[PDB]
């Protein structure tokens, strides 16, 4: 099974799904539009959380970075009054270097991802959506900037007026991911940001058409009128899509076959039908691995039905 | 006073010299031929040691790196079995980054040094010999490799056949270093490797000529027939230089005025007079900071007389 992942929402669903099926059978196509080179090294926030989740070192308190990771280099620079851009731990920085080096030797992002997987001994198959550069810029009333500067740098406070995912047009679906799609027909769209996470992935040239030939199940990242987290609340509207389990469904309307939103939003059954997808409510507020496991079973069943 | 330095000998003499004259007056021109980019950030071993020496945070046990540094990012990659090249401390890396960020934003090596200086509060004037790149490769009986790979990597065991200081011929004396020679008239050649540390500096175009117009004093880095430490043992001879307090004085023959070698070998003082430099013995073996201050006073007295 193939799973499009963001960096929080989906990896949580994965936290439970990796208890339902066999890991080797789980291939994850991770978003890279959030990637960024910091302090001389490439950081793949999304791609990393997934590696860390499966390598069993993810900090479940915030869902980013390694658990009990030290902050030497960081804290030292904090004393000198120099913000690095994001809290980078020592062990976490190792992932950035280990990867970057490989990239520096001519190898690709996927290559590094592979080596990182083998190093962490993760049975699953993590694969960045694309080897080509893609950056998510957020057009705010204060000025156009990078996602990181907006979310972390500005605490997601700026007033968003637009979203610009650059390079996605010139990017190419990772050959390893295309290869994976061949021997697969079940693709899950984790409950992650539709604009800045799934967006970049489905926006890659050929993807949208490739997703049609497969059975696509999706878990709404919106519970009510707003997301469980993240700036999807400002991005989505300012992007055209309405912040609702209904909007999310319309967004993937071109390929979404089975949808699964939260029960707190029981909505028109025939409404979803007009979009051409089988709806279904369920408890999606993953408050623990058990809830993730519980919702994951609901998902595994969605495919089966 | 201008002072040519390496990363061990000279910064040791400096350790005492900084107790004799007002720091503001100490201008240190460090060697950058040892510089190399590691794990995405530029490292300047010589330039860094001097920075840590005055910022009073240098590890005096090995005389490199920060005192009581942690190694999170290091030990981590160690586990994953990845050699980074050199043991990089976490705080020590913060330096590499801070400097590198400035370099990457359009600033020069010298700029990064000035900022790190104030960031560390050092009053002295630490300046790299040049903003341009220069690397010291050693031709061993195993192939042409980089100094780091030779000394740190191969423990310096490989049989040296020749030394190549690439770039120096196309490098240019740092604008600030030249601006320094404009004001100062006292040049002290610290007791560092005359081939791979001091050499690189006096090899810069138009440099060996500026030394002729100034009062030059040097301290033999070779006590007897071998150096207190450093690969000075193989490099010098394999490069065509006599490994002795005598060969040293001969090397800087074209600009040397006052020479100060160890007392453990009262050489033919008349041999020096017909070498173009006033010899002088002294306990150059710097055991503690007191021995440095002690010797540092003999150096000031040498310039005064
Ligand atoms: N259903 C559900 N959605 C969640 C949960 N936690 C986070 N999310 C959603 O997952 C998304 C976070 O995924 P991601 O794209 O990685 O987030 P970002 O980079 O932090 O903005 C948000 O849109 C949230 O609404 C959860 O426990 N349950
Ligand atoms: N006279 C004297 N020389 C020293 C002392 N400590 C180290 N040295 C010499 O200084 C040199 C080391 O200088 P440097 O270029 O900084 O060394 P590197 O970091 O090993 O490449 C060697 O040639 C040593 O023999 C000391 O206490 N007294
Ligand atoms: O909201 C945040 N998200 C973060 N997400 C990260 C993902 C990585 O792979 C590495 C570092 C970070 C750091 C932060 C951070 O400081 N704040
Ligand atoms: O002999 C050594 N010298 C070293 N010298 C260094 C100088 C720096 O500025 C930073 C790191 C190192 C590390 C080493 C090392 O591991 N071994």
UniProtKB/Swiss-Prot annotation, chains A, B:
Q: What is its EC number?
A: 2.7.8.28
The UniProt keywords, alphabetically, are: Magnesium, Transferase
* Pathway recorded for this protein: Cofactor biosynthesis; coenzyme F420 biosynthesis
Q: Which reaction does it catalyse?
A: (2S)-lactyl-2-diphospho-5'-guanosine + 7,8-didemethyl-8-hydroxy-5-deazariboflavin = oxidized coenzyme F420-0 + GMP + H(+)
* One example of a Gene Ontology biological process annotation: F420-0 metabolic process
Signal sequence: where? none
Needed cofactors, names only, are: Mg(2+)
Broad enzyme group? transferase
InterPro entries listed in its UniProt record: CofD, CofD-like_dom_sf, FbiA/CofD
Any idea which GO molecular function terms this record carries? LPPG:FO 2-phospho-L-lactate transferase activity; magnesium ion binding
Q: Which Pfam family, giving just one, matches this sequence?
A: CofD
Q: Which Gene3D superfamilies match?
A: CofD-like domain (1.10.8.240), CofD-like domains (3.40.50.10680)
Annotated residues that bind 7,8-didemethyl-8-hydroxy-5-deazariboflavin are located at 48, 87
- Write out the function statement from the record: Catalyzes the transfer of the 2-phospholactate moiety from (2S)-lactyl-2-diphospho-5'-guanosine to 7,8-didemethyl-8-hydroxy-5-deazariboflavin (FO) with the formation of oxidized coenzyme F420-0 and GMP.
Q: How does it assemble?
A: Homodimer.
PANTHER family under this entry?
2-PHOSPHO-L-LACTATE TRANSFERASE
The record's similarity note reads:
Belongs to the CofD family.
Protein name (database record): 2-phospho-L-lactate transferase
What organism is this sequence from?
Methanosarcina mazei (strain ATCC BAA-159 / DSM 3647 / Goe1 / Go1 / JCM 11833 / OCM 88)
Q: What is the lineage of its organism?
A: Archaea, Methanobacteriati, Methanobacteriota, Stenosarchaea group, Methanomicrobia
